[PDB]
């Protein structure tokens, strides 16, 4: 029946950490004539606007910044919930109180500010502070390998809040994320289940276990494809829909 | 003896939350043919570029962003200072940890994010965090007025770190500031007291207590004038210098 194409953005539609090429932009739009298309990323709407254009809500049938906790369908904003409503204020606090009590114990070269960034669907936690300078960031990054700060930190939290239904992911140089079980990229599948699609195709460049696309790739709701590079994604879309 | 005029930027030479007008700017450049000019405000340099224009460091003899922590003189940088450099990594770590542990002990209805905001000349501390919504600030302030939460926090901080050159001033609805003693507008005087000016005129709009210009206005090294708007600063300058 009717189908929908779901695309991860970074590394899938674009070269990593760069805007999309217009060659691909035109290909996607030529493909939109055949079926509906959608995009999903962990970055905020502004970053997705940067990587794929300002008009992005107007050129894609769905746009799912922040893994889908901000969700646009056909130009209009959907239905949204945040981390406070879902977990409840007491667990939030109990988790915030723990992270602060833990960071106060870490011994570091330098510490700065914004130790917990409250996002829409996660708590970013940085032992050094997100306010860090670019130099202090690389310096903390390198010490974290040597003495396993973030790793040991995530281990204590997994144990202390086991069963409270949270996932802990480490990314980048300074931080790790804390988010509710299932609020990775398969969160946006909430918005495409009831819209009557026979097949929902997904494309992502990190379908390996431990990658940002794995859980949405292995989800039964998606016929998932594993893409190596943007050109591969066009290679695969050329074969299915034409 | 030669004289120097120092203005606060917001309210004195500009309309509040507005860029300087072309008339004010031009007026000042003609005052600069009679006397030496200097501007001081608590905003960082880039905002100060938004208020007075991007060429600001040629236009005045002295440009003192962030109350003088940044200091340009005669077009060039004369000095830079932050509180990490001044108190040193060790004790500002001790001051961060104490604040992190103390916040974990606070039983609040809602905790959010950005409890410790790092700024170049002050730490901004908020038990509930600055990311919270206005509606939640009010909820915390109605709690705070009853249960004296910032009052008690500041107390213990004052018993912990005040033989170390720190001042604590509660302010606003949710937070309070932690800064080295005398890092108000009074700070920039160390840069001009050595250039041999007999009288140092100061023009500010908030010279009464609880004001950002109060202490520089009360300072014996400054011949201070309280100003109600830019039309008034001009009127006073005329009566003083021509
Ligand atoms: Cl924080
Ligand atoms: Mg990707
Ligand atoms: Mg699947
Ligand atoms: Mg002012
Ligand atoms: Mg004075
Ligand atoms: Na952003």
From Swiss-Prot, chains A, B:
Changing residue 173 to H: In CDG1A; partial loss of activity. Keywords: Acetylation, Congenital disorder of glycosylation, Cytoplasm, Disease variant, Isomerase, Magnesium, Metal-binding. It is found in: Cytoplasm. The active site is at 8 (nucleophile), 10 (proton donor/acceptor). GO terms for molecular function: metal ion binding; phosphomannomutase activity. The keyword rRNA-binding does not apply. Mg(2+) 1 binds at residues 8, 10, 205. It comes from the Eukaryota. It catalyses: alpha-D-mannose 1-phosphate = D-mannose 6-phosphate. Involved in the synthesis of the GDP-mannose and dolichol-phosphate-mannose required for a number of critical mannosyl transfer reactions. This is Phosphomannomutase 2. It comes from Homo sapiens. The lineage of its organism: Eukaryota, Metazoa, Chordata, Craniata, Vertebrata.
